Ligand binder design. Sequence first.
Ligand SMILES: O=C(O)CCC(=O)C(=O)O
Ligand SMILES: [Fe+2]
Length: 287
Amino acid sequence: ATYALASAELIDGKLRFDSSDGFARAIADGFFFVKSPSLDLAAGDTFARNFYLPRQEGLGAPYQGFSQWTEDRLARREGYFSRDVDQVEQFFLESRFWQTVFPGPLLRQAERMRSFSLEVLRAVLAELDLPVELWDEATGRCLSMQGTYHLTFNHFRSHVRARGLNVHKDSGWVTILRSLEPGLEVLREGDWLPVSPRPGEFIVNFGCAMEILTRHSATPVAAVAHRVQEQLPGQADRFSYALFVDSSLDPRTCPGLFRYLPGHGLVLEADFEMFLNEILHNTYQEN
Ligand SMILES: O=C(O)CCC(=O)C(=O)O
Ligand SMILES: [Fe+2]
């Protein structure tokens, strides 16, 4: 519970770690720190503290009242959610909705977070056993701006009596997490490792797609389980928000989940269109 994650700075398109073993620990730990490149985080910090409030007429109004943005106005699992089994009250939003839903300054912050997240992804791929010509297809066309990018906000309600948020692994490639306060814990060597945020840095982790891609290469990358500890009603309300990078979900753009096989190239391990054809037949037969 005292192990320190590796930490890097993004310089000239490569991750410069503060120790020589840093990249190797990062892909073994599944989590690592990256210095924020002087990003303006105020619009996101404001939204994180206001989206769930009722909207009034102050200067915070554009960041308030996002209970109006529910799934029926967006798509399923997008928008505002007050779930109760964990403390977390959330706002999920994929990039195609950003210009419509977010105020100007938050729109710009989300777009800069997305581009930063993709620079981090490219910097990781540069160190992996993965030929450069395969990067765009291997990672689901997220690098050519055809992927799925969520900015998600977490409001931890101290007055609610439950887990911060339950154990989960992320689905996609990289996640860039902005947080200021303790609570995050990650699974390392069987034990839960508390991770305290560092000022001016993001926390980065990998998702299942990244592990599927690399686990048969010379440089397997771990997607690691993580959770948030219950926040106490001794004046908590913790806040966080993260940019999730996922593959395109359109089989006509990304056929599914690849594995890289050294010497052989990319092999399609999950064929999205084939699976959708099977679901159609099951749905047809089931009724
Ligand atoms: O709030 C945190 O510290 C982590 C949040 C997280 O992992 C998530 O939103 O998926
Ligand atoms: Fe997560």
